[PDB]
């Protein structure tokens, strides 16, 4: 049948790619709701005009002032749209901790949640896990999509290890000394039209991978000491599962987020023609190498935060957003990003308590930002 | 819940590894029968003592006499052992088309046929398929084990291509001129697997991969034009499935037959500790290259034979067996193996008819052997 899809964060990278998948597959999907922040209001309005979807939300009231016919506007507009729209699938492609309430609202409706928003799991943690029922959350991230597919190769009891792949970033194989003179521009900070500056940076520092490791644990229920990371520079293998007999199952495709997006939308049904397959007509190789955890401890710190539990992973992530932005502003060096994350985490044991509300999560993040700010400033 | 296993070809490469898996897993498996040719009585008597199984078949009459009190002896011994032994699993690890009657007898008992002896399925074709219920034949070779595991990654309608990997043999990358000089000693070594003499030779000539393409079509029902072959020198990836959305799912492990053996014996349940997993704490690469079909046409010839159908795959295999014997005896050169296969197949018009009985298959093989000898006589 046809799936009714609410797209939250419709004007972003994931949201617009999802809309292309949906436009290409009118037999499988219909859009029944769109939500955006308001900074790309003009795009949202064009999306209404193109799709005919009038069921739209804009977070920014100023932005909403410019139109006069937005059904949902202002604070919690996305949450209100979710609560009042009948849908089969909610795609949460919101950015930041503001994706958390809409995730909670979506889960309550009993719709499938195609989840891109990282903070929903990294920060929301047990709050989101307790609200979700088995199979309700389908991950959009290419690594987690890869794992979901590879886990089909046996029962849950047959899993030995989850193995995530990492590109290694621009500083792959760089020594600690090399890393000292890393500049913002080198860390991939360009004024790129779609990609945020934090995405290349988080990939470069291996924090993105630390975040994906935390989400892997929460999504798939595998202990942190059984979640490995291997460096794979080609980014063709998106992740692997190693089973108790010694068999490894791997997912492979040329990079293209439309593959994992399409499958998260249509889960468990694959979407024909979503992306190009690996081609074996020309000679190639898939390389693997270990990560030097002494030079790149971001993944180890993510495991420490995840093992501690509660709001510790919210602290990990909020510490990074602060430390990473400080690096981008010249206020710290590159190696100091993960150094600050570790310093903030070491002081954060009060946040190991489980969050009862969204407000507990925000408080932890608030504390973590302030703590990182003091570490950056010297105060 | 212990599975009773009859092991045919117990003294060989697969047979001994299978006994090792069973010895390591008395919880899951018991040996209840052993069959061998009689050329290695040392090993067989050792196996009798260690397993405590006296229910034994020896093909060679003189060899069985030397031992004394062997219950089944002569060329029908393995077949009669199967017909008269109660078991849950028959592991057919015999070599050559001589495994046909034990394969048919095994299937007739209703036991699972764990098939190492792909030649009997290649030879039997639809005759063997009509004898089996769905899922009764469970492949032991790494390729089809990999395919079966990877096919769990989607539903049947989602399968676009099956991708078999080939090591390429010791002569991977060699020219046709280079191949002229190949000796049985050179062809008797394999870069990645340790196997019996016939599979070692067939891997050097690429006839093994040709036989596996036919096996894939017969076991999985996939058309010949959707079965790809790619050369992978490391033999770590054992085969892959490409799905309609562009996703590829692959199975990988250090070459060790104990892995696919364990899974075939216990299907669908994986056997804990069977084999070592891929190790990602040290650098490695998985390489792919196309097969040079001009230098190695054995897979294309297998395709032509498979497409023709009926008794034509029995002809392909039987031609190979004769040519291979002539190469190993010093009568013909290495390139003449696939040359003779081509010459015999292209004279084999009458053999596209579907076998109604075993005798149809026997007739096709008899014709093919005679025709192969004529080709040998001509050089
Ligand atoms: N991009 C990728 O390739 C990948 C992304 N992810 C994760 O998926 C999530 C989204 O990715 P991405 O599409 O790149 O993010 P983007 O920045 O590209 O798009 C974010 C979307 O959120 C909207 N938004 C911001 N604030 C609000 C609000 N208060 N209410 C409603 N909507 C709002 C924005 O609207 P507006 O534009 O008008 O401000 C925009 O449409 C992130 O958490 C990211 O970590 C995971 C794997 C890879
Ligand atoms: N070896 C491997 O790693 C792999 C094997 N295969 C397949 O498995 C099958 C066997 O492999 P492999 O172990 O190497 O073969 P082997 O040469 O190592 O052993 C063959 C076995 O069959 C027995 N045998 C030979 N002739 C007769 C006969 N006339 N009657 C009854 N039994 C007989 C032999 O007993 P004896 O010699 O003591 O008289 C021996 O135990 C092949 O079809 C091959 O294609 C598939 C994938 C990989
Ligand atoms: O399981 C192991 N094999 O089937 C051996 C494959 C050898 P080849 O790829 O060279 O045919």
Swiss-Prot record, chains A, B:
1-deoxy-D-xylulose 5-phosphate binds at residues 118, 142-143, 167, 190, 203, 208-209, 212. Mn(2+) binds at residues 141, 143, 212. One of its GO terms (biological process) is isopentenyl diphosphate biosynthetic process, methylerythritol 4-phosphate pathway involved in terpenoid biosynthetic process. NADPH binds at residues 11-14, 37, 117, 119, 196. Its EC number is 1.1.1.267. Pathway: Isoprenoid biosynthesis; isopentenyl diphosphate biosynthesis via DXP pathway; isopentenyl diphosphate from 1-deoxy-D-xylulose 5-phosphate: step 1/6. It catalyses: 2-C-methyl-D-erythritol 4-phosphate + NADP(+) = 1-deoxy-D-xylulose 5-phosphate + NADPH + H(+). The keyword Zinc does not apply. GO terms for molecular function: 1-deoxy-D-xylulose-5-phosphate reductoisomerase activity; cobalt ion binding; magnesium ion binding; manganese ion binding; NADPH binding. Pfam families: DXP_redisom_C, DXP_reductoisom, DXPR_C. Disulfide bonds: none annotated. Belongs to the DXR family. This is 1-deoxy-D-xylulose 5-phosphate reductoisomerase. It comes from Mycobacterium tuberculosis (strain ATCC 25618 / H37Rv). The lineage of its organism: Bacteria, Bacillati, Actinomycetota, Actinomycetes, Mycobacteriales.
